Amino acid sequence: APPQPVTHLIFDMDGLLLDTERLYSVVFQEICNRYDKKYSWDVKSLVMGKKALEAAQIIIDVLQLPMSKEELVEESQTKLKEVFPTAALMPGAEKLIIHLRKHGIPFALATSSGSASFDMKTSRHKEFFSLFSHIVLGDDPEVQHGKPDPDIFLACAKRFSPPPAMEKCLVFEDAPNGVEAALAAGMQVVMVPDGNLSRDLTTKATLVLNSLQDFQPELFGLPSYE
Ligand SMILES: [Mg+2]
């Protein structure tokens, strides 16, 4: 469907604004390989956008790992805490966010990451995340399930004042679960997937781009870059 104008933007964090998915990947690969299993792209495609416990359970079930979701979360989080602060902004992220800010376009963050993980990941980036109108995290009491459940995006949209119609919201996502959550919420979505994701999982979004650098805001009725 052709892109329609929007007034409010909602961003994913992991893999979209920050390069944190590579950190998850290295840690889960190390754990999976102990058990002679490969933490592969098909598995990643299932768990990106999920809350930590949800993701862990899926990894365990799909790869048949001999652990509980609680054990996998505890171990992986212990390892990830050491490296989360090294997260870096993705290409085009700063340019876009600063542009939206200048033009007073409301935008917010909607991430399945919990509080502690968010705090660690954003250690070097507090000035960037301070530009968001508001932030909804995965441990928000209003949000029961991770993506592809639409609740995190619905909750995020409802916290703008005044709240927009969902159809005037534009989501930015790197993950197929996030694309599905946006569509289920009645929102348009720009996907910026890793090119290793399958064709089937990267042909559902309103627009699919190789980089945020390629996003043309005017396509959605927003101001062009200066
Ligand atoms: Mg993501």
PDB file of C-alpha atoms and ligand atoms in Angstrom:
ATOM      1  CA  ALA A   1       0.000   0.000   0.000  1.00  0.00           C
ATOM      2  CA  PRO A   2       1.303   3.510  -0.829  1.00  0.00           C
ATOM      3  CA  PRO A   3       2.743   5.503   2.082  1.00  0.00           C
ATOM      4  CA  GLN A   4       0.262   7.852   3.748  1.00  0.00           C
ATOM      5  CA  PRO A   5       1.135  10.937   5.813  1.00  0.00           C
ATOM      6  CA  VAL A   6       1.867  10.570   9.506  1.00  0.00           C
ATOM      7  CA  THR A   7       2.187  12.905  12.470  1.00  0.00           C
ATOM      8  CA  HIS A   8       3.808  10.774  15.185  1.00  0.00           C
ATOM      9  CA  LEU A   9       6.773   8.390  15.025  1.00  0.00           C
ATOM     10  CA  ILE A  10       7.576   5.389  17.193  1.00  0.00           C
ATOM     11  CA  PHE A  11      11.043   3.825  17.221  1.00  0.00           C
ATOM     12  CA  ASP A  12      12.338   0.448  18.222  1.00  0.00           C
ATOM     13  CA  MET A  13      15.698   0.491  20.001  1.00  0.00           C
ATOM     14  CA  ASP A  14      17.625  -2.781  19.640  1.00  0.00           C
ATOM     15  CA  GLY A  15      18.986  -3.327  16.153  1.00  0.00           C
ATOM     16  CA  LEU A  16      17.221  -0.194  14.835  1.00  0.00           C
ATOM     17  CA  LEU A  17      18.715   2.737  16.776  1.00  0.00           C
ATOM     18  CA  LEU A  18      21.507   0.812  18.565  1.00  0.00           C
ATOM     19  CA  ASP A  19      23.718  -2.022  17.334  1.00  0.00           C
ATOM     20  CA  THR A  20      22.825  -4.193  20.324  1.00  0.00           C
ATOM     21  CA  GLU A  21      21.679  -7.235  18.354  1.00  0.00           C
ATOM     22  CA  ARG A  22      25.298  -8.179  17.675  1.00  0.00           C
ATOM     23  CA  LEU A  23      25.832  -8.291  21.455  1.00  0.00           C
ATOM     24  CA  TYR A  24      22.883 -10.605  21.977  1.00  0.00           C
ATOM     25  CA  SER A  25      24.116 -12.718  19.075  1.00  0.00           C
ATOM     26  CA  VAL A  26      27.645 -13.262  20.395  1.00  0.00           C
ATOM     27  CA  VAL A  27      26.388 -14.194  23.876  1.00  0.00           C
ATOM     28  CA  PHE A  28      23.661 -16.539  22.670  1.00  0.00           C
ATOM     29  CA  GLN A  29      25.993 -18.111  20.100  1.00  0.00           C
ATOM     30  CA  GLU A  30      28.539 -18.881  22.831  1.00  0.00           C
ATOM     31  CA  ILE A  31      25.872 -20.473  25.028  1.00  0.00           C
ATOM     32  CA  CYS A  32      24.250 -22.392  22.164  1.00  0.00           C
ATOM     33  CA  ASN A  33      27.554 -23.785  20.908  1.00  0.00           C
ATOM     34  CA  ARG A  34      28.282 -25.427  24.307  1.00  0.00           C
ATOM     35  CA  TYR A  35      25.412 -27.668  23.392  1.00  0.00           C
ATOM     36  CA  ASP A  36      26.518 -28.141  19.776  1.00  0.00           C
ATOM     37  CA  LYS A  37      23.712 -25.908  18.507  1.00  0.00           C
ATOM     38  CA  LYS A  38      23.951 -22.893  16.207  1.00  0.00           C
ATOM     39  CA  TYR A  39      22.306 -19.602  17.142  1.00  0.00           C
ATOM     40  CA  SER A  40      21.200 -19.032  13.575  1.00  0.00           C
ATOM     41  CA  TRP A  41      19.356 -16.328  11.686  1.00  0.00           C
ATOM     42  CA  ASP A  42      16.131 -18.336  11.615  1.00  0.00           C
ATOM     43  CA  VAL A  43      16.198 -18.403  15.442  1.00  0.00           C
ATOM     44  CA  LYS A  44      17.124 -14.715  15.722  1.00  0.00           C
ATOM     45  CA  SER A  45      14.136 -13.915  13.504  1.00  0.00           C
ATOM     46  CA  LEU A  46      11.837 -15.527  16.063  1.00  0.00           C
ATOM     47  CA  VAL A  47      13.130 -13.719  19.130  1.00  0.00           C
ATOM     48  CA  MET A  48      14.028 -10.168  18.088  1.00  0.00           C
ATOM     49  CA  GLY A  49      11.362  -7.947  19.633  1.00  0.00           C
ATOM     50  CA  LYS A  50      10.423 -10.364  22.398  1.00  0.00           C
ATOM     51  CA  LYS A  51      10.867  -9.704  26.100  1.00  0.00           C
ATOM     52  CA  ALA A  52      13.902 -11.438  27.625  1.00  0.00           C
ATOM     53  CA  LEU A  53      12.069 -14.374  29.197  1.00  0.00           C
ATOM     54  CA  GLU A  54       9.941 -14.883  26.068  1.00  0.00           C
ATOM     55  CA  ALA A  55      13.029 -14.893  23.872  1.00  0.00           C
ATOM     56  CA  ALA A  56      14.859 -17.291  26.144  1.00  0.00           C
ATOM     57  CA  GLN A  57      11.979 -19.780  26.108  1.00  0.00           C
ATOM     58  CA  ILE A  58      11.845 -19.726  22.321  1.00  0.00           C
ATOM     59  CA  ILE A  59      15.603 -20.302  21.989  1.00  0.00           C
ATOM     60  CA  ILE A  60      15.324 -23.199  24.418  1.00  0.00           C
ATOM     61  CA  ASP A  61      12.374 -24.797  22.626  1.00  0.00           C
ATOM     62  CA  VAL A  62      13.617 -24.344  19.057  1.00  0.00           C
ATOM     63  CA  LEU A  63      17.219 -25.418  19.739  1.00  0.00           C
ATOM     64  CA  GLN A  64      16.222 -27.860  22.518  1.00  0.00           C
ATOM     65  CA  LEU A  65      18.665 -26.416  25.074  1.00  0.00           C
ATOM     66  CA  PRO A  66      18.827 -28.187  28.453  1.00  0.00           C
ATOM     67  CA  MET A  67      17.977 -25.120  30.563  1.00  0.00           C
ATOM     68  CA  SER A  68      15.052 -23.114  31.905  1.00  0.00           C
ATOM     69  CA  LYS A  69      14.178 -19.686  30.556  1.00  0.00           C
ATOM     70  CA  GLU A  70      15.094 -18.222  33.948  1.00  0.00           C
ATOM     71  CA  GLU A  71      18.537 -19.828  33.810  1.00  0.00           C
ATOM     72  CA  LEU A  72      19.123 -18.626  30.263  1.00  0.00           C
ATOM     73  CA  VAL A  73      18.083 -15.071  31.084  1.00  0.00           C
ATOM     74  CA  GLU A  74      20.258 -14.979  34.208  1.00  0.00           C
ATOM     75  CA  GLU A  75      23.349 -16.297  32.446  1.00  0.00           C
ATOM     76  CA  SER A  76      22.975 -14.260  29.281  1.00  0.00           C
ATOM     77  CA  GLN A  77      22.189 -11.054  31.207  1.00  0.00           C
ATOM     78  CA  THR A  78      25.258 -11.540  33.399  1.00  0.00           C
ATOM     79  CA  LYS A  79      27.388 -11.699  30.260  1.00  0.00           C
ATOM     80  CA  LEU A  80      25.568  -8.909  28.436  1.00  0.00           C
ATOM     81  CA  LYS A  81      25.878  -6.460  31.321  1.00  0.00           C
ATOM     82  CA  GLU A  82      29.610  -6.283  30.604  1.00  0.00           C
ATOM     83  CA  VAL A  83      29.128  -5.304  26.956  1.00  0.00           C
ATOM     84  CA  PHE A  84      25.789  -3.443  26.686  1.00  0.00           C
ATOM     85  CA  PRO A  85      27.455  -0.035  27.380  1.00  0.00           C
ATOM     86  CA  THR A  86      29.550  -0.447  24.214  1.00  0.00           C
ATOM     87  CA  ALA A  87      26.401  -0.165  22.081  1.00  0.00           C
ATOM     88  CA  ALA A  88      26.670   2.383  19.276  1.00  0.00           C
ATOM     89  CA  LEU A  89      24.133   4.351  17.260  1.00  0.00           C
ATOM     90  CA  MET A  90      23.087   2.904  13.918  1.00  0.00           C
ATOM     91  CA  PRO A  91      23.768   4.768  10.674  1.00  0.00           C
ATOM     92  CA  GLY A  92      21.300   7.595  10.050  1.00  0.00           C
ATOM     93  CA  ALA A  93      19.799   7.446  13.544  1.00  0.00           C
ATOM     94  CA  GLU A  94      21.232  10.727  14.835  1.00  0.00           C
ATOM     95  CA  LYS A  95      20.452  12.570  11.605  1.00  0.00           C
ATOM     96  CA  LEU A  96      16.831  11.484  11.618  1.00  0.00           C
ATOM     97  CA  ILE A  97      16.116  12.089  15.301  1.00  0.00           C
ATOM     98  CA  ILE A  98      17.702  15.545  15.304  1.00  0.00           C
ATOM     99  CA  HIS A  99      15.698  16.419  12.158  1.00  0.00           C
ATOM    100  CA  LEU A 100      12.403  15.351  13.751  1.00  0.00           C
ATOM    101  CA  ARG A 101      13.259  17.364  16.836  1.00  0.00           C
ATOM    102  CA  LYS A 102      14.050  20.530  14.924  1.00  0.00           C
ATOM    103  CA  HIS A 103      10.692  20.362  13.190  1.00  0.00           C
ATOM    104  CA  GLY A 104       8.780  19.538  16.372  1.00  0.00           C
ATOM    105  CA  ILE A 105       7.608  16.162  15.089  1.00  0.00           C
ATOM    106  CA  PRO A 106       6.607  14.079  18.128  1.00  0.00           C
ATOM    107  CA  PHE A 107       8.391  10.749  18.456  1.00  0.00           C
ATOM    108  CA  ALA A 108       8.813   8.096  21.109  1.00  0.00           C
ATOM    109  CA  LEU A 109      10.623   4.833  21.870  1.00  0.00           C
ATOM    110  CA  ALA A 110       8.925   1.457  22.257  1.00  0.00           C
ATOM    111  CA  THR A 111      11.301  -1.332  23.197  1.00  0.00           C
ATOM    112  CA  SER A 112      10.843  -4.776  24.758  1.00  0.00           C
ATOM    113  CA  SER A 113      14.090  -4.206  26.686  1.00  0.00           C
ATOM    114  CA  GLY A 114      13.719  -4.016  30.460  1.00  0.00           C
ATOM    115  CA  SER A 115      14.799  -1.129  32.683  1.00  0.00           C
ATOM    116  CA  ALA A 116      18.254  -2.347  33.654  1.00  0.00           C
ATOM    117  CA  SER A 117      19.164  -3.377  30.118  1.00  0.00           C
ATOM    118  CA  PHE A 118      17.922  -0.048  28.726  1.00  0.00           C
ATOM    119  CA  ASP A 119      19.970   1.872  31.288  1.00  0.00           C
ATOM    120  CA  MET A 120      23.128  -0.059  30.403  1.00  0.00           C
ATOM    121  CA  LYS A 121      22.652   0.119  26.631  1.00  0.00           C
ATOM    122  CA  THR A 122      22.165   3.879  26.769  1.00  0.00           C
ATOM    123  CA  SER A 123      25.198   4.625  29.009  1.00  0.00           C
ATOM    124  CA  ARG A 124      26.989   6.535  26.237  1.00  0.00           C
ATOM    125  CA  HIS A 125      23.854   7.954  24.662  1.00  0.00           C
ATOM    126  CA  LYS A 126      21.804   9.735  27.307  1.00  0.00           C
ATOM    127  CA  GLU A 127      21.720  12.951  25.258  1.00  0.00           C
ATOM    128  CA  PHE A 128      20.244  11.099  22.273  1.00  0.00           C
ATOM    129  CA  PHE A 129      17.553   9.321  24.266  1.00  0.00           C
ATOM    130  CA  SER A 130      16.696  12.577  26.048  1.00  0.00           C
ATOM    131  CA  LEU A 131      15.270  13.819  22.749  1.00  0.00           C
ATOM    132  CA  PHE A 132      12.375  11.343  22.736  1.00  0.00           C
ATOM    133  CA  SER A 133       8.953  12.581  23.799  1.00  0.00           C
ATOM    134  CA  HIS A 134       8.585   9.471  25.964  1.00  0.00           C
ATOM    135  CA  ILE A 135       9.811   5.888  26.269  1.00  0.00           C
ATOM    136  CA  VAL A 136       7.945   2.622  26.837  1.00  0.00           C
ATOM    137  CA  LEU A 137       9.990  -0.346  28.028  1.00  0.00           C
ATOM    138  CA  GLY A 138       9.316  -4.070  28.061  1.00  0.00           C
ATOM    139  CA  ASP A 139       8.757  -4.155  31.812  1.00  0.00           C
ATOM    140  CA  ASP A 140       6.070  -1.470  31.569  1.00  0.00           C
ATOM    141  CA  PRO A 141       3.028  -2.728  33.533  1.00  0.00           C
ATOM    142  CA  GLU A 142       0.697  -1.826  30.646  1.00  0.00           C
ATOM    143  CA  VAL A 143       2.569  -4.194  28.292  1.00  0.00           C
ATOM    144  CA  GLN A 144       1.916  -7.888  28.996  1.00  0.00           C
ATOM    145  CA  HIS A 145       3.642  -9.484  25.990  1.00  0.00           C
ATOM    146  CA  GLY A 146       6.466  -8.654  23.615  1.00  0.00           C
ATOM    147  CA  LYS A 147       6.246  -8.103  19.902  1.00  0.00           C
ATOM    148  CA  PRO A 148       4.410  -9.234  17.743  1.00  0.00           C
ATOM    149  CA  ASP A 149       1.707  -8.333  20.274  1.00  0.00           C
ATOM    150  CA  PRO A 150       0.733  -4.727  19.398  1.00  0.00           C
ATOM    151  CA  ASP A 151       0.329  -3.555  22.974  1.00  0.00           C
ATOM    152  CA  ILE A 152       3.745  -1.913  23.306  1.00  0.00           C
ATOM    153  CA  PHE A 153       3.060   0.287  20.265  1.00  0.00           C
ATOM    154  CA  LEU A 154      -0.553   0.987  21.262  1.00  0.00           C
ATOM    155  CA  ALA A 155       0.618   1.946  24.748  1.00  0.00           C
ATOM    156  CA  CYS A 156       3.323   4.160  23.309  1.00  0.00           C
ATOM    157  CA  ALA A 157       0.916   5.965  20.944  1.00  0.00           C
ATOM    158  CA  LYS A 158      -1.617   6.574  23.714  1.00  0.00           C
ATOM    159  CA  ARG A 159       0.959   8.522  25.753  1.00  0.00           C
ATOM    160  CA  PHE A 160       1.325  11.345  23.231  1.00  0.00           C
ATOM    161  CA  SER A 161      -0.736  14.396  24.210  1.00  0.00           C
ATOM    162  CA  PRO A 162      -3.059  14.675  22.411  1.00  0.00           C
ATOM    163  CA  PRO A 163      -2.964  11.025  21.334  1.00  0.00           C
ATOM    164  CA  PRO A 164      -2.978  10.451  17.557  1.00  0.00           C
ATOM    165  CA  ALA A 165      -5.144   7.974  15.713  1.00  0.00           C
ATOM    166  CA  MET A 166      -3.068   4.825  15.367  1.00  0.00           C
ATOM    167  CA  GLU A 167      -3.168   5.194  11.573  1.00  0.00           C
ATOM    168  CA  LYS A 168      -1.207   8.467  11.826  1.00  0.00           C
ATOM    169  CA  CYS A 169       1.664   6.721  13.634  1.00  0.00           C
ATOM    170  CA  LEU A 170       4.769   5.478  11.861  1.00  0.00           C
ATOM    171  CA  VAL A 171       6.837   2.713  13.431  1.00  0.00           C
ATOM    172  CA  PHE A 172      10.522   2.090  12.697  1.00  0.00           C
ATOM    173  CA  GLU A 173      11.622  -1.504  13.246  1.00  0.00           C
ATOM    174  CA  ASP A 174      14.451  -3.878  12.423  1.00  0.00           C
ATOM    175  CA  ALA A 175      12.588  -7.074  13.354  1.00  0.00           C
ATOM    176  CA  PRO A 176       9.776  -9.082  11.777  1.00  0.00           C
ATOM    177  CA  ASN A 177       8.026  -9.362  15.147  1.00  0.00           C
ATOM    178  CA  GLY A 178       8.047  -5.577  15.329  1.00  0.00           C
ATOM    179  CA  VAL A 179       6.684  -5.190  11.821  1.00  0.00           C
ATOM    180  CA  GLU A 180       3.811  -7.527  12.706  1.00  0.00           C
ATOM    181  CA  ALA A 181       3.149  -5.652  15.963  1.00  0.00           C
ATOM    182  CA  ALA A 182       2.961  -2.357  14.078  1.00  0.00           C
ATOM    183  CA  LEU A 183       0.573  -3.772  11.467  1.00  0.00           C
ATOM    184  CA  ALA A 184      -1.552  -5.356  14.212  1.00  0.00           C
ATOM    185  CA  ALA A 185      -1.685  -1.909  15.880  1.00  0.00           C
ATOM    186  CA  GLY A 186      -3.013  -0.374  12.648  1.00  0.00           C
ATOM    187  CA  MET A 187       0.197   1.586  12.046  1.00  0.00           C
ATOM    188  CA  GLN A 188       2.471   1.997   9.054  1.00  0.00           C
ATOM    189  CA  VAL A 189       5.990   0.684   9.513  1.00  0.00           C
ATOM    190  CA  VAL A 190       9.414   1.282   8.018  1.00  0.00           C
ATOM    191  CA  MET A 191      11.612  -1.773   8.343  1.00  0.00           C
ATOM    192  CA  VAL A 192      15.411  -1.566   8.330  1.00  0.00           C
ATOM    193  CA  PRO A 193      16.233  -5.263   8.458  1.00  0.00           C
ATOM    194  CA  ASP A 194      19.538  -7.003   8.532  1.00  0.00           C
ATOM    195  CA  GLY A 195      19.964  -8.363   5.030  1.00  0.00           C
ATOM    196  CA  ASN A 196      20.336 -11.905   6.397  1.00  0.00           C
ATOM    197  CA  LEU A 197      16.644 -11.995   7.315  1.00  0.00           C
ATOM    198  CA  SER A 198      14.517 -13.971   4.898  1.00  0.00           C
ATOM    199  CA  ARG A 199      12.575 -12.522   2.012  1.00  0.00           C
ATOM    200  CA  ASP A 200       9.309 -13.698   3.583  1.00  0.00           C
ATOM    201  CA  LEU A 201      10.175 -11.802   6.762  1.00  0.00           C
ATOM    202  CA  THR A 202      11.224  -8.584   4.994  1.00  0.00           C
ATOM    203  CA  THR A 203       8.384  -8.027   2.505  1.00  0.00           C
ATOM    204  CA  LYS A 204       5.509  -7.119   4.858  1.00  0.00           C
ATOM    205  CA  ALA A 205       6.352  -3.559   5.973  1.00  0.00           C
ATOM    206  CA  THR A 206       5.083  -0.350   4.410  1.00  0.00           C
ATOM    207  CA  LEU A 207       8.633   0.444   3.320  1.00  0.00           C
ATOM    208  CA  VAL A 208      11.817  -1.630   3.609  1.00  0.00           C
ATOM    209  CA  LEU A 209      15.216   0.076   3.623  1.00  0.00           C
ATOM    210  CA  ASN A 210      18.837  -1.009   3.888  1.00  0.00           C
ATOM    211  CA  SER A 211      19.645   1.847   6.260  1.00  0.00           C
ATOM    212  CA  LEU A 212      17.951   4.699   8.117  1.00  0.00           C
ATOM    213  CA  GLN A 213      20.174   6.865   5.925  1.00  0.00           C
ATOM    214  CA  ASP A 214      17.887   5.948   3.034  1.00  0.00           C
ATOM    215  CA  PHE A 215      14.701   7.151   4.736  1.00  0.00           C
ATOM    216  CA  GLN A 216      13.073  10.056   2.909  1.00  0.00           C
ATOM    217  CA  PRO A 217      10.785  11.786   5.420  1.00  0.00           C
ATOM    218  CA  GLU A 218       8.761  13.524   2.696  1.00  0.00           C
ATOM    219  CA  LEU A 219       7.413  10.166   1.560  1.00  0.00           C
ATOM    220  CA  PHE A 220       5.304  10.222   4.744  1.00  0.00           C
ATOM    221  CA  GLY A 221       4.433  13.903   4.500  1.00  0.00           C
ATOM    222  CA  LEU A 222       7.208  15.016   6.845  1.00  0.00           C
ATOM    223  CA  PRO A 223       9.673  17.851   6.151  1.00  0.00           C
ATOM    224  CA  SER A 224      12.564  17.046   3.797  1.00  0.00           C
ATOM    225  CA  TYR A 225      16.115  17.157   5.117  1.00  0.00           C
ATOM    226  CA  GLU A 226      17.632  20.648   4.854  1.00  0.00           C
TER     227      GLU A 226
HETATM  228 MG    MG B   1      14.733  -4.392  17.319  1.00  0.00          MG
END
